[PDB]
């Protein structure tokens, strides 16, 4: 039973500096994976500067002031990951955890109507006791009576206030996804062709808005809308478009010279 | 009219001091459904394993009673699917396959003949001779050395 993380064995997307202490806050089991989450001490202290250390950081959390998906989370080690909605009523800001196109976690600011729904991907389907078919989700939810057209690769729109699955997005050819793993993580694209290969990993071929073709495993894609215009959720400021490394290097030198 | 006339003992398969039966299905049903009964006569359990492997003519219409068999048991084929050539068939219902490969040495820019031998459980659906090329699928441990189980035999 591990209870510690070393700050070197912590994920790189958290961006904790190696010289500040040996340890990182090991996220508890919960909704999201340990490799694939951002625990609430890092959001309150390192992302947002509401807390200067971990001692000011539990003055916020243990008091019941941060809400992940409409419910107050008093754990600094609670795993918040992809598509979660983090509200704070006192400062009046609410955010969504999305991946930006460089693969890192990004806090997308939200309205009040956009902060009620979240988008969740089915990971398993089974029948529970009774004859109730429940749907297992990447965020750990077990929706008991989902839309009967739910398959495993699909996306359920959820509305975390009134816990009612308001919508369904099937996983087909004509849909748009966001990639949540691999080298292509954070990129958004239309689906082109899904190569099955039964017994092994499904490969999904994807085309971007510019036309850049790229592939991933189909367990890494997360469908978020009917097309790239009609996305069901708002995405970070690049909107899944990965610029060239040369062109994005030129633009920062131009912006820094034009600023002085 | 009250008497049923059940099936007689098939001594060709019954050799083994306990009665050889399949645990999946009951042999003794009076009005057995069309679920598991095969073409000619008797009740049989046959299963379709995964990866586009066609079950043989035996294991559906055969008479043998095999546990540890991928087509007629709870043995599931999963993980690795490999190929080898049959080396020895001297064991009872088990063959040893030989996997011959070239090992490249990065220093001396030249390959090197190596081999791995695997004990593979062989169903009575199959009779492979030495030199036959087989396709094996990984299963659970079935003995001290058996992890694989033959799925298809390619003759000669």
């Amino acid at each position: 039973a591990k209870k510690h993380l070393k700050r070197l064995y912590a994920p790189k997307d958290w961006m904790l500096s190696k010289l500040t202490g040996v340890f990182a806050p090991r996220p508890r089991p919960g909704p999201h994976k340990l490799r694939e989450c951002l625990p609430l001490l890092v959001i309150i202290r390192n992302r947002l500067k509401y807390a200067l250390n971990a001692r000011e950081g539990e003055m916020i959390l243990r008091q019941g002031l941060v809400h992940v998906d409409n419910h107050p989370r008093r754990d600094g080690k609670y795993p918040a990951g992809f598509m979660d909605v983090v509200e704070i009523p006192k400062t009046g800001d609410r955010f969504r955890l999305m991946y930006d196109v460089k693969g890192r976690f990004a806090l997308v600011s939200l309205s009040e109507a956009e902060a009620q729904i979240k988008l969740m991907k089915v990971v398993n389907l089974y029948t529970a006791t009774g004859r109730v078919p429940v749907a297992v989700t990447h965020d750990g939810h077990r929706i008991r009576y989902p839309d009967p057209h739910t398959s495993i690769g699909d996306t359920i729109v959820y509305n975390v206030k009134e816990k009612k699955c308001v919508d369904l997005i099937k996983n087909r050819q004509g849909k748009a996804v966001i990639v949540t793993g691999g080298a292509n993580r954070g990129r958004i694209g239309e689906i082109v062709k899904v190569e099955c290969h039964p017994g092994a990993f499904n490969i999904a071929h994807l085309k971007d808005a510019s036309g850049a073709e790229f592939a991933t495993r189909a367990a890494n894609i997360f469908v978020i809308g009917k097309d790239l215009n009609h996305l069901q959720v708002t995405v970070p400021k690049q909107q899944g478009l990965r610029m060239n490394v040369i062109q994005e290097r030129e633009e920062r030198l131009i912006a820094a010279e034009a600023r002085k | 009219p009250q008497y049923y006339h059940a099936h007689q003992v098939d001594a060709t398969i019954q050799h083994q001091k306990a009665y050889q039966r399949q645990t999946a299905v009951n042999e003794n049903m009076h009005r057995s459904s069309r679920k598991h009964v095969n073409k000619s006569g008797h009740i049989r359990y046959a299963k379709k394993i995964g990866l586009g492997f066609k079950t043989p003519a035996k294991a559906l219409n055969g008479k043998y009673i095999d546990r540890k068999c991928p087509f007629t048991s709870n043995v599931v084929i999963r993980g690795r699917i490999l190929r080898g050539i049959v080396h020895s068939t001297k064991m009872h219902r088990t063959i040893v396959i030989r996997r011959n490969y070239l090992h490249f040495i990065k220093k001396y820019q030249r390959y090197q003949k190596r081999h791995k031998s695997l004990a593979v459980h062989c169903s009575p659906a199959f009779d492979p001779k030495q030199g036959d090329e087989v396709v094996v699928g990984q299963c659970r441990p079935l003995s001290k050395t058996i992890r694989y189980n033959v799925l298809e035999v390619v003759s000669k």
Partner: protein, 183 residues
Amino acid sequence: GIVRSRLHKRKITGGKTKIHRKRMKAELGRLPANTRLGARRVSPVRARGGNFKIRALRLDTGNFAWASEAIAHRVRLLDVVYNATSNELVRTKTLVKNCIVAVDAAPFKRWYAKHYGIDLASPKLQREWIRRRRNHRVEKAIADQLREGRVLARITSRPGQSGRADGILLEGAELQFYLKRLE
């Protein structure tokens, strides 16, 4: 203690394995139950996860199923008749899985008079007996030992694992298999 590892087994080359750890608790085994006939005495065993595994010592009764009729009846074990592992386990009358036992046969006859109405007259209103009994027939080797008093049967549960002596009645070629080995 008792271990279930391959550290003591020789390699397939015949080489000895040199041991560089202590025994783990996660690789243990325990002493066998050796369940016999007798009045019921069980001892639970604390397994992994805190689950309980009920050792059966001295069992005398179980739920035996008659699979053509898809019913079961709690009957009393009489004798241990044939065991495929050893004839020495018959003599000490050990209950294991798949050993052949004789059971009481009285609830099976009484059920066969209550259902199908055949003895080995009182509800004249309900002859749903006639709705059955026409298509169905009963194997002769069952009906002989059913009225003889004891029925040969096969244990289908693991008593040292579950603390139960459940079973099935021998039918078909399986009964005719074991009748030849006895007599």
